[PDB]
Every structure is written in structure tokens, then in C-alpha cells.
Amino acid sequence: TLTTNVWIEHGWTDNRLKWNAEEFGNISVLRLPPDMVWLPEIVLENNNDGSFQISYSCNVLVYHYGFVYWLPPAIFRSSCPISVTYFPFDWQNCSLKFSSLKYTAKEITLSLKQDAKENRTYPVEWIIIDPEGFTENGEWEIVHRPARVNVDPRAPLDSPSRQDITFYLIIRRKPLFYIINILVPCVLISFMVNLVFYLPADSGEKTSVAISVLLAQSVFLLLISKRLPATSMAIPLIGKFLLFGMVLVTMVVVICVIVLNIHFRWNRVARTVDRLCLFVVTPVMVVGTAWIFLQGVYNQPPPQPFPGDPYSYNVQDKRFI
Amino acid sequence: SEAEGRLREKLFSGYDSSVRPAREVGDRVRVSVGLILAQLISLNEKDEEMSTKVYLDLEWTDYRLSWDPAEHDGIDSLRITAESVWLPDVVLLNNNDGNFDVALDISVVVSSDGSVRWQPPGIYRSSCSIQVTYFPFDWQNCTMVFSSYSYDSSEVSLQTGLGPDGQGHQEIHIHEGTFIENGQWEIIHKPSRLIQPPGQRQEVIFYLIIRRKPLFYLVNVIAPCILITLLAIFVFYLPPDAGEKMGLSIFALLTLTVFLLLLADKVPETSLSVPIIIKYLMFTMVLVTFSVILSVVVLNLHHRDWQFVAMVVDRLFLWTFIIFTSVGTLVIFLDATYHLPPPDPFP
Amino acid sequence: FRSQTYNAEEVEFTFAVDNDGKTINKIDIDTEAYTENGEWAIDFCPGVIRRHHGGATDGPGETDVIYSLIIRRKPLFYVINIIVPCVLISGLVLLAYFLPAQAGGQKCTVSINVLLAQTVFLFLIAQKIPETSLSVPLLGRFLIFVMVVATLIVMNCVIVLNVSQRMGNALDNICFWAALVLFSVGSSLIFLGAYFNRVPDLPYAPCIQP
Amino acid sequence: SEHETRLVAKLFKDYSSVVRPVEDHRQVVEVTVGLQLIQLINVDEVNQIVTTNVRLKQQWVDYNLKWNPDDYGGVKKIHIPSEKIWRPDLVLYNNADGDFAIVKFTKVLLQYTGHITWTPPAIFKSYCEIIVTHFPFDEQNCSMKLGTWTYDGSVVAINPESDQPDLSNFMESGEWVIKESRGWKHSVTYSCCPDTPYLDITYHFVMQRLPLYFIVNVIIPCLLFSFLTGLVFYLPTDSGEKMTLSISVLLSLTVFLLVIVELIPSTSSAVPLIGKYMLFTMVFVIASIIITVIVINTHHWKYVAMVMDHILLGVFMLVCIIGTLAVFAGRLIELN
Amino acid sequence: QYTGHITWTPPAIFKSYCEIIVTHFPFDEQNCSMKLGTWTYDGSVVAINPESDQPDLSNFMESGEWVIKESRGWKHSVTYSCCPDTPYLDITYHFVMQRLPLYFIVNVIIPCLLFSFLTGLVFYLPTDSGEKMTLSISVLLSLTVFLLVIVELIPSTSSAVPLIGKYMLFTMVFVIASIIITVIVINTHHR
Numbered sequence A: 001t002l003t004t005n006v007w008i009e010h011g012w013t014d015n016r017l018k019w020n021a022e023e024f025g026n027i028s029v030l031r032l033p034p035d036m037v038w039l040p041e042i043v044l045e046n047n048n049d050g051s052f053q054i055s056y057s058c059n060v061l062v063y064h065y066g067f068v069y070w071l072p073p074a075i076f077r078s079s080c081p082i083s084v085t086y087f088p089f090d091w092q093n094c095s096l097k098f099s100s101l102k103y104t105a106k107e108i109t110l111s112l113k114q115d116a117k118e119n120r121t122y123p124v125e126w127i128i129i130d131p132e133g134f135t136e137n138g139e140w141e142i143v144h145r146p147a148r149v150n151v152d153p154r155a156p157l158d159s160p161s162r163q164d165i166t167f168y169l170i171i172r173r174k175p176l177f178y179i180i181n182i183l184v185p186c187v188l189i190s191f192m193v194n195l196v197f198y199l200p201a202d203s204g205e206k207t208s209v210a211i212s213v214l215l216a217q218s219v220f221l222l223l224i225s226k227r228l229p230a231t232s233m234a235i236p237l238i239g240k241f242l243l244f245g246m247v248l249v250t251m252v253v254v255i256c257v258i259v260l261n262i263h264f265r266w267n268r269v270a271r272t273v274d275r276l277c278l279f280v281v282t283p284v285m286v287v288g289t290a291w292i293f294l295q296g297v298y299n300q301p302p303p304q305p306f307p308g309d310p311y312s313y314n315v316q317d318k319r320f321i
Numbered sequence B: 001s002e003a004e005g006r007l008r009e010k011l012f013s014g015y016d017s018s019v020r021p022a023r024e025v026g027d028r029v030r031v032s033v034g035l036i037l038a039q040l041i042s043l044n045e046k047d048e049e050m051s052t053k054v055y056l057d058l059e060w061t062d063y064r065l066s067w068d069p070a071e072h073d074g075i076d077s078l079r080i081t082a083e084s085v086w087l088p089d090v091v092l093l094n095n096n097d098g099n100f101d102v103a104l105d106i107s108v109v110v111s112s113d114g115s116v117r118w119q120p121p122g123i124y125r126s127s128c129s130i131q132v133t134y135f136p137f138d139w140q141n142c143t144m145v146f147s148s149y150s151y152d153s154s155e156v157s158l159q160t161g162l163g164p165d166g167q168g169h170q171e172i173h174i175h176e177g178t179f180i181e182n183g184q185w186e187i188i189h190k191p192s193r194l195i196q197p198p199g200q201r202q203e204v205i206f207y208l209i210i211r212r213k214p215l216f217y218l219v220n221v222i223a224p225c226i227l228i229t230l231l232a233i234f235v236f237y238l239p240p241d242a243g244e245k246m247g248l249s250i251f252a253l254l255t256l257t258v259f260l261l262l263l264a265d266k267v268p269e270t271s272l273s274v275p276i277i278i279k280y281l282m283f284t285m286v287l288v289t290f291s292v293i294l295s296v297v298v299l300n301l302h303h304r305d306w307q308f309v310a311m312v313v314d315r316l317f318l319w320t321f322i323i324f325t326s327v328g329t330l331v332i333f334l335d336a337t338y339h340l341p342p343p344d345p346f347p
Numbered sequence C: 001f002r003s004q005t006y007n008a009e010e011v012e013f014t015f016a017v018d019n020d021g022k023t024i025n026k027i028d029i030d031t032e033a034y035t036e037n038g039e040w041a042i043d044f045c046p047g048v049i050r051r052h053h054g055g056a057t058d059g060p061g062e063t064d065v066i067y068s069l070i071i072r073r074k075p076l077f078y079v080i081n082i083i084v085p086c087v088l089i090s091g092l093v094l095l096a097y098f099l100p101a102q103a104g105g106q107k108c109t110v111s112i113n114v115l116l117a118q119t120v121f122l123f124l125i126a127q128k129i130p131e132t133s134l135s136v137p138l139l140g141r142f143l144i145f146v147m148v149v150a151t152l153i154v155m156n157c158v159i160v161l162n163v164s165q166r167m168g169n170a171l172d173n174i175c176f177w178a179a180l181v182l183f184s185v186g187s188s189l190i191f192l193g194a195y196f197n198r199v200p201d202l203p204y205a206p207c208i209q210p
Numbered sequence D: 001s002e003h004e005t006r007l008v009a010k011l012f013k014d015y016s017s018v019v020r021p022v023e024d025h026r027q028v029v030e031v032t033v034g035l036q037l038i039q040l041i042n043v044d045e046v047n048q049i050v051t052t053n054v055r056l057k058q059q060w061v062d063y064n065l066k067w068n069p070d071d072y073g074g075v076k077k078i079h080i081p082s083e084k085i086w087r088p089d090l091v092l093y094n095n096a097d098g099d100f101a102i103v104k105f106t107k108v109l110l111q112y113t114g115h116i117t118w119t120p121p122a123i124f125k126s127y128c129e130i131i132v133t134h135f136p137f138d139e140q141n142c143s144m145k146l147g148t149w150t151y152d153g154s155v156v157a158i159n160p161e162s163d164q165p166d167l168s169n170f171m172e173s174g175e176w177v178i179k180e181s182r183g184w185k186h187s188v189t190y191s192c193c194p195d196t197p198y199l200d201i202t203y204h205f206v207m208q209r210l211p212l213y214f215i216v217n218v219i220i221p222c223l224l225f226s227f228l229t230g231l232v233f234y235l236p237t238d239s240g241e242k243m244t245l246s247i248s249v250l251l252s253l254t255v256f257l258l259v260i261v262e263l264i265p266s267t268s269s270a271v272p273l274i275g276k277y278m279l280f281t282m283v284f285v286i287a288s289i290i291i292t293v294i295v296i297n298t299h300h301w302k303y304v305a306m307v308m309d310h311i312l313l314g315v316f317m318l319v320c321i322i323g324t325l326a327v328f329a330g331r332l333i334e335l336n
Numbered sequence E: 001q002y003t004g005h006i007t008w009t010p011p012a013i014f015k016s017y018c019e020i021i022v023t024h025f026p027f028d029e030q031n032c033s034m035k036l037g038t039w040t041y042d043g044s045v046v047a048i049n050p051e052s053d054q055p056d057l058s059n060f061m062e063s064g065e066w067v068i069k070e071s072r073g074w075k076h077s078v079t080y081s082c083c084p085d086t087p088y089l090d091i092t093y094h095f096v097m098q099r100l101p102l103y104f105i106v107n108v109i110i111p112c113l114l115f116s117f118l119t120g121l122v123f124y125l126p127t128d129s130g131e132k133m134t135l136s137i138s139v140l141l142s143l144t145v146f147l148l149v150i151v152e153l154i155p156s157t158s159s160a161v162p163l164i165g166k167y168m169l170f171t172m173v174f175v176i177a178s179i180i181i182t183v184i185v186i187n188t189h190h191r
């Protein structure tokens, strides 16, 4: 679920609400309860909890030339399907989809707002964000924020599903918290098993260390499985690492048991098997760990918000008419 | 809109939305019920509750709302706020939280011949009996039961909606490019049926047959338990002189207990049956307990030719535990795999 | 309880009067139907009517009725599931001294594993106690004291082993007696404060009649 | 529809929902009350609250809502919004923290004789004393006291539809079985008023727990730990692992205590039987640790220590079995 | 009142957005603000004036975890390029709240200090005792178990690393290094 605070700037023309200001004491703008005027009745279609409508019914501003401007603020909880593959270095493609259920594409037309520079108009094809007042979220960074009017040619023109406006938030996770609190401890504890081969067989603690590391990995797996949804379409990168690590820890337990079974029969043979299995498993551990983690480290959202569309949907790329 | 305003004012003169549109006293209002699934929000096995976002698709004839379009400026259909027309009180009978009604009374569409079509959104939390036995490889068969709360079968007659081809498409509709797919459940069968009463009401039941995708529980629980079982096996290959046999076996038990704490946050709480994964956990805990007991027996032999006897007994225990473990795990996995969703929703 | 709209010169409170003519200046509870809570009990429940002025220049008067529910915890669940296990776990620490000070001895092993169990109890307790910082709970103080003492026993056993592997039994005995006295006195002092600070005798009538 | 439109307009032109629907103020409105239990949603032993899904059928005659069917084309019954008519104000007297009254105002079926049937749904969160001592094998007698809040028995008399609640539509709960159920009407008298009775209908349900879940997830692990506790006395001292085994079993039991606390009710009214068993097992492990320390000190006399071990193994295993039986077998026999 | 003067004192629950700073956690001070203003009326049709320089704290119930060090309301008027004439007005109240650190000192700092102390003590323990490895492993396990508490108590904000989180990571690295060095020393002694 994505929870956002948004201000939805509606604009439309209602010629029934025109007046000459000079006939009414130079009143150029009027503020009215939204219950008085006709509304286009736009709703968040992909909401997650049955809150389809705007939260706070503030006044509409009606200008003398008939323009009706509305800026209702709303709290929305939309359905954002998560992709867990590269977690924690993941990025999510959430969206907010606005449409009318009371009116179809034949009765009202959805369009993006047009701004102007040098008397040339261009559509506002992105989410507006205050460049100085916007407090960034503590865990997510907004990479792209495009907007599209979607029309489905196969839908009937007299159905409400034909047209909508979708605003996309492509957000990136900030991984530092999970690196510090999860990734580094888990990786170091997992790598500690490489020292199990190094510890002398006469110490009598090698299996103890290995099984304790397995227990610690179990605790981390519990924590992460608490923190992530049980999606079965993919395995998270930290989950893949934990599985690989537990597999290797089990294999090191097996090797240690074999080495000790040799030792107490042979001591030089046991030590040689220890060192050989060290020189085998430790580089395999390192290479697998790097292969796993680098796949997430270089994971990034694509430079264009829509693959196969060269347009950037970005403020500096004003697509003038 | 002069003509629309005049027609709208005409139709509702003397109309009463509280009175059903039966022309004769014995007439029944036929209501077609269809369902569009927008999102399977979740299934909860602790509450035995399935949460879905749907659009209803209700159609009926209200003779009071017919008009001649050629007289009224060619207006051939009209959009009207649903509070102002008579609505069948079709409600979700098997809801779990006391929310019977639709989420938002959007407008109905009225055709000039009086056909009223209404497609309100609903968020619903129906009760659903969970087949806990094969969890997590289970499939579920959840139902949504729609019926009029008030009217009898002698007053409102329900029937399943037809498809776009006019066929008896008695199914939940799912648009491929619109449906929000669920990360854990796959929809297999989605029929609908009309249920006749044995003063009595008909019901329309829509069935979701959904299969759990097991990869998460395989990775996070089943594979760890297999690894723990393998370590409990190799406990018997560790010689008595290592002095770590108790340490290894009991720490394996502790790790198994931690995975039990993990799973206990997931399993259904009802006691009608034991999950196959819970059976597997209990079997593995029993295996670890027996490994501890037999390791103590071997050590009690060793510390007394007694060392050779102890070693032979340890070998025998290794092979016997291997046999028992393989038989148990093979039976468990075969039983979990052969349980499959049926080819027919009504076997 | 107060009127949301009206000041004290517009609406005024008085307590109801029972059929005996006595004013019910307290919360009323009926003995034959009231079910006690599974965690708390009610001891006193006096009511008072208060009057003030909201305007600092003696403006419009304000008035409210305040009822003081004096409630008491039933500790049995915490005694059985928390206090007794923690006490016995902390008592297990002292056995480290009797264990041999030579190879195969597990003095530090037992002490640190007991501390780990006490850390699991720390997690369990931290799940329950609220996060406010106005004071430290008795249970928290006892837990912290136990953990500190366990670390001191670990240090002492390490010192004893370092001396032995270079007096071992004498150091073990003297540190055992010191730790036993310190632990017993500290636990007693921690727990005893709840006895003196139990719910006091108060002039009010009991909320539930015998 | 035309006939029924005329009928509804004529019925409610001058209807008053404030006053009781009697012809004479000295008459008593007689209300039949039937409780249908659709689903037992939850039992909360900690807060002592039972959550149930119910239909509360109420039937009474409204004197002013009669009509002649022949005036209206043979219309013999209609459905009307229940907000328009007078209704009895049934309140759930032992409401814990839900709604006291009905809040889902569904339609009323009105017949030409003036007979009204209303069947609103409700979710009742009733308060009842929970007896946890035998948990999980316990049974609870929990009740729903219904009555008119502001009318006394001299102006509105309520009568139970049947001596038992309606369970025909009851969905089977997965953790509780309703052993029995019954509704009793009561008529209390007060010293102010020898004439006017105060009436209530108390429905009650005796429901029994299905303990299997708590057997599998709680009892069996504790039993396994208890059985592993005494095994240390079979372990030779020459292994040196006696302390390691006992301490690690203690630690695993301590970790499982987290699961126990997560699962069992944290009620302080009395210790649940599984709580007794857990504390017994914990004390038993602690005692086994103390005894292991004593035996080790004795060995460092070897034959004496070995004979002590052989005796204590049997003693501890017998104590384990005896405690398990004394805990569970008696209640199982009561259930048998 | 007969003068036409209206007083309205509605209750509200405000969930304001505040830029929490976690670097000094738990000893942090937060400056949190409530920006109030007319949504649709601009300063040329409705003017809002603060009643006093400070919020009214006379009825303030004392908090169990934060102490309000100071408070202050400031009225602001802003100009935009659409409109030279019409100001936009807001009143920003702010409160400087200081956390009471005692809870986090008790429940977080002391366990980490104890684990560090044990990790230090493990070096005075003789090699011939054999307890070294068991000691370091037990301390690592206890720290890992307490991490399940730490991750619940420490805020998951990735905006900055909390000081207590840095101390936790330092303790973890110290334990890891102690284990590695213990292994090295054990191997050295067996040479």
C-alpha cells in the first residue's frame, strides 16, 4: 500500500457561471462550497481501502470568465504491487490512477494541465513537487514522476474504463539503514564460517561455531521474512544471499563433521582436508556473495520512465505545442 | 441541458424509490447479477477471511423509467445518481465484518426502454473456510454469496449475468490488462451459480478457486528444515570424542525452535486439522529429540571393547535414522505434491 | 466531565442522592453484577466537583466533575511467567563458582549463557513496558542489576581462571559469598520498594462494598 | 407499484415514530425477540469479550399500520425503511466495547394486519467472565443480556420467540463448539415500584474449546523439553557435555517461552493449566541444572556419583511423566 | 456576543509533518511546526492574526517522553509573481521538544555496554581454559538476539544513521574482530 498526501488541481469551464465584474463591483473571483456547483466527480480508481473520493471538500474558486478551479487536498492509499527482486536496492513503480465512475469518456474529457512560457504553452506531463518545501521521505527517493492520459481503444466509448489519468511515482529505496542494520552484520557473520576451517581441530568448537552462525542466519531470516511480503513470483536478493549462506553453512558443518571423524580415527589428513576445503569454499563464498550483491548494487531505474519512449517527462524538457 | 433537465424532471414526478417496480401485484423483478474482480486484495487464514475489490454488475427493468427518445430530443440513455432510483438491496450475505453494502453509490445508467444498469464498486471481506491440511501447498475455494436482504424469491428473482457474446457466461469477469494480479495466489476457476431455495430467497454464488504459489514457504521454511534435518542426521557421524554432539544436536533443536517461532506467525489458528508443514515441523522436532537421545545412548556406551560397540551402535543409529527420515520426508512431500486443485469447480 | 458549551454560571453540577438521602459522591458499582477485570482491581473511586475562573481577572466561572479511579494491578501473571523465571535464572549464576577452575570447567560458559537467557527475558519485558522516561520500572531495575552482576561474575571467573592457569578455590569461595550477599540484598531492596509504595490507606470509602 | 406507492403515502402521512404504537396508552406493546447466531467471531480471554455475528429478529403489531388489501389491489405485505417507524430500543446490557444498540437499520416487512418483522444484523461484543484455569480444555458459559433501555415491563413486554436461540444458519467455528444454548426471560422487581416489572431476555451459550491446536503448538514442545531435561543424568560425566546439554536445553525452553507468551492468554485472573505446565518444566530444568552441578562436584566417590546419576535419571523421568499426567489426564478424563 | 463577536474553539487532532533529525538520537531536540492558513481565501479577503506570540500551554498535559523547551507563533506573508498586490498569509506555530533519553539509556545503551565489556574481558581469559571461543560466540549470539530489540527501538529512517545505531554497528564490528583475533591467537598458540 502506498500512502500519499496530494493536492489534486482540477480545472474546467462552466459558462453558466460567467459574470461581468464591472456590473458586480469588480468581483473577479468567487469562493463557493463544492456542493453548490456541478463537479466532474473524479475518484482514485486504484485505491486500496474504499476511499475513492477526495478527503477535504474545500471551496472551489470560480473566476468571472467562467473558469472553475479546485484544489482539494486528499490522503490516498493506493495499491502499489511491490517488486522484491533486488531488495534492499530495489525501486518501485507506484501509480495513482484517476478517473470518473459517474461520467464516461463521452461526457467528460480528461487532459493534463498546460503551463506557458514565452507565450508558448506546453502540457504539464509530470508530478508537481515543491523544490524547497518538499520534505523528502525517510526511506524513498523520487527518481521520475511522469503523468499520462491513458485511453483504451478496445473499451466502449460509453464505458468509464476507457479513459483515465495516471501519475507514476518511480521511487528508489535508500539502502543505508538496511546496509547498517541487516546487510553488514549478516554478511560478516556468514563470512565468519570461513574461519571454522582455520580453527584447530583440537579446539572442539568448530561445529559449535558453525551451528551458532546457522542460528544467527535463522534469526536474520526471521526478521527479513517479517519485513517482506510472502510474494512467490521472486526471491529477494537478501533472501537469495541468506539461502546461499545457509546452504554453505550446512555444507561446512558436513565438512567439519567429516574432518573430525577423520581426526579421531589421521590428524595430518584431517588438517589437509580442512585446508583444502577452506581454499575451496572461501573463494566460492566470496564470488557468490559478490555475484549476488553487485546485481543489486548496479540496479537502477531506466533513464526514461517508459521503456521504448524517448521522451523524458521532465521539467527541463518542456514539450511546447 | 434543457432536454435532459426536462426529461429528468418528468421521470421522477411521483416516483418512489422505496417501492419496487412490480407492475402487477404478483410480478417479480428479474435482477441479473454479474461480478468483475478488480483486485484480490488478500486472503487471511487466521481470520478465515478473503478481501476483494470488485465491481458489481446489476441489471433490472424499472418500467417507471422508460421514455420515448424521439420525443425527448433523441436522448437514448440517462445517467442518474443511484440514491434516487429503486435499487435491489443485493448484499454480500457471507461477509465477515458486518459490511453488507457497496463502497460507493455511483450513478446508474437508464436506457429509454427502462433497463437500469448499475456497476457499483465494493470492498468486501467474505468468510472463507480454509483447507489448512496441505498448507502451504494448498488451494482454496472461497465463495461470495449475493442476495437481496429484504425481498423474497416471490418479489425479486436473481439470475447470473450473461457474457458479451450473450452466452451464459456464468463466471467472474477478469480483464487481462486491468486486473491487479496477486503475488501469492493464482486464480484457476471462477464460475458462478444460481442457488434455488429448498418466504425464501435465491442466492447467486461466485466462486474463486485460487492456488497458493509455494516458492516463499519453500525457500524460507521448507529448505531450512531440510538443512536442519541433514545436520540432525550427520550428528550420528560425528565421533564421540569430538565432544560437540550434544552442542550440535541441541543447537539444531534451538534453530528449529526459532523457525517454529517464525512459522507460528503464519499458520492458521483453527484446530480443525493440522497443516502438513506443521506435521513436518513436529516430525523434525521428534527426529532431533531422538537424535539427542541416541547420541546420549552412544556416549553412555563409549565412556564405559566398549568404544567399538559404541561406534557400531552409532553406525546402526546413523543408518536407521537415515531410513526413517527418508521415509517420513518422502511420504510428506508426496502427499503435499499429489494434492492438487481439481479440474472441475464442482467435482 | 464538563459541559462543552456552558460555563459555571449557566450549568452547575451536584452529585445524585441515594434513597437513604446520602450523596453518591463517587463512582457507583453494583456488587451483584460487576465483573472484575482480569488484570486490574478497583480500590477507591471518589468524585469531586471543581470550580475555577477561566478569565484571570475572575472572568466567567468554570466547573467540572472529576472522578478518581484508584486501580491496582494483579501481579500474578508477571510473578509466574516473568519474575520467578528471572529470579531463578539469576540464581543459576552463582553455581559458576562451584564448577571446576580447570579445563572442562564451564563457569564462564554457564554465566554468559544465563546472561543470554536474561537477554531474551529483556526482549520479552521490553515488549511490555511503556517507553516513557519519567521513571525506571522495578522489573527493569532488577533486570539491569541482574545483567550487571552476571557481567561481574564473568569478570571474576575470568580472573580466577587466569590465576589458576598461571588461590583458585579461595577466590572462588570469597567471590561466591560476596556475589550471593550482594545479589540477595540487591534483589530484596529492589522488590521491597513496592511493599512500602503499595496503594495507600485513603480516607475514601471503598468503591465496592464487602 | 402504483397501489403500493399510494399505500405507503397514505400510511405515513401522519405517522408519529415517537409514541408507542398502541391504541390505548394503558395497553402494553408486546415484542417477540428472537436471536439468530450466524457466527461466533472471536473469544478474547484477555479482555473477556465475546464477538458474535447475529440477526436480532423483532416482531410486534403497530396499531396504526393496518390496511385493507382490497383497497390496494391485493397488496398484503410491503417493505419499508425501518427509520420511519417506532421501534423497541433493545440494548445489549453487557456490551463490552461495541455498539449498545442496533445500528444497521435494514428494511421492515409490514403486513396488512399491522404485524411488523424486523431482522437487523448486528455484531455483539458481549462481556462475560472467562475461566482460564483448565486452559486449553476449558468451556465458557457466556451470555447476552438484551432489554429495552428506557421502557419498563408495564409499557413494552418482550417475550422470547423460542426457548433456544436459532442456530440453523450458524457457521461452524474453527476453535469453539457450542455445547448448548438457551434463552431465559427474567422479570426483576424493585423497592420503588411493586407494580412495574423490569424485563430482560438473557441468551446464553455454553461453548467448549477445541484444544488440538494448543496441543500441537504449545503442549508438545514443552513435553519434548521436559523429556530432554532428565536425559542429562544418562550422559556420562567423562563427556563434559552435561552442563552444555542442560544449559542449552534451558536456553531453548527460554526461547520457546517467547512463543508461549505470544500464543497463550496473558490473563492474571488465574494461571492457565499450560502456564502451570510451563512453570513446572522451567523449575524442573533449573532443578536438573542444580543437581547436575551437585553431581559434578561429587565426581570431582565416582561410584557414588554414578549410582546417584542412575537413581536421579529414573526419579526425574518419573517426575516428568507424573507431572504430565497430573496436568492433562485428569481434564481428559473429565472430558471423557 | 451581541457585538457580533464570534468565538469558536473546536477541538482537533493534528498529525503534522515534521523533519525528524535522528543523528544525535536519543538525546535529540526536534523543532516541529504547524503551518495554519486559509486554504482558499488569500490575504486580501481574509487576514489572520496570531492571538499571542506563543501558543497557550496553560492546559498542556505533561508528556512522558518529550519536554517542550519553547514555543512560538510567527505570522508570514508571501508574495508570488502572479499577483503583486495580494499577499498570502500563514501562521506557523513551532515547538522545540526535547526527548527524555532515560528509557533509551536503560533499554539500549546498557546492554551494548555490557556486551562490549564482555568482548573486552574475553582477552584476559586463558587459552588453556577453552572458554574463549564459547565466550565470544555466546556474546555474538546475545548481541544478535538483542538486535531484534534494537531494530524495533531504533527508527528505520535511512535519512541518517542514528548515534545509537552507529554504536550498535561498532559493537558488532568489535565482536567480529575479537572473534577473528581469538582464532588467530588460538592458531598461534597451537603452533
Ligand SMILES: *[C@@H]1O[C@H](CO)[C@@H](O[C@@H]2O[C@H](CO)[C@@H](O[C@@H]3O[C@H](CO[C@H]4O[C@H](CO)[C@@H](O)[C@H](O[C@H]5O[C@H](CO)[C@@H](O)[C@H](O)[C@@H]5O)[C@@H]4O)[C@@H](O)[C@H](O[C@H]4O[C@H](CO)[C@@H](O)[C@H](O)[C@@H]4O)[C@@H]3O)[C@H](O)[C@H]2NC(C)=O)[C@H](O)[C@H]1NC(C)=O
Pocket (backbone or CB within 6 Å): A093, A095, A148, A150, A151, A152, A153, A168, A170, A301, A302, A304, A305, A306, A307, A308, A309, B177
Ligand atoms: C511503470 O508502470 C507502467 C504501468 O502502469 C508502465 O507503463 C507501461 O509502459 C509500457 C512500455 O512503455 C507500455 O507498453 C506500450 O504501450 C502502448 C500503449 O498504447 C495504447 O494505445 C494504442 C493505440 O494508440 C494501442 O494499440 C495499445 O494497445 C497495445 O497493447 C495491447 C495490450 O497488449 C495490445 O492488444 C495492442 O495490440 C497494442 O499492442 C495501447 O492501448 C502500446 O502501443 C505499445 O505497444 C507497442 O510496443 C510493443 C512492445 O513493447 C509491441 O509489442 C506492440 O506491437 C507495439 O509496437 C506498448 O505496449 C504500457 O502500455 C505502459 N502501461 C501503461 C502506461 O499503463 C511503465 O513503463 C513502468 N515504468 C517503468 C518500469 O519505469
Ligand SMILES: *[C@@H]1O[C@H](CO)[C@@H](O[C@@H]2O[C@H](CO)[C@@H](O[C@@H]3O[C@H](CO)[C@@H](O)[C@H](O)[C@@H]3O)[C@H](O)[C@H]2NC(C)=O)[C@H](O)[C@H]1NC(C)=O
Pocket (backbone or CB within 6 Å): B141, B143, B193, B205, B207, B209, B342, B344, B345, B346, B347
Ligand atoms: C467449492 O465449494 C462449494 C460449496 O461452498 C462447492 O459447491 C458444492 O458442490 C457440490 C458438488 O458439485 C454440490 O453437490 C451437489 O448436490 C446436488 C444435490 O444433492 C447433486 O445433484 C450434485 O450432483 C452435487 O452432488 C453442492 O451442492 C455445492 N454447493 C454449493 C453451495 O454450491 C464446490 O463444488 C466447491 N468447489 C470445489 C472445486 O471443490
Ligand SMILES: *[C@@H]1O[C@H](CO)[C@@H](O)[C@H](O)[C@H]1NC(C)=O
Pocket (backbone or CB within 6 Å): A021, A022, A023, A024, A025, A026
Ligand atoms: C470597478 O473598477 C473600476 C476601474 O478601477 C472603477 O472605476 C469602478 O469604480 C469600480 N467599481 C465598480 C462598482 O464598478
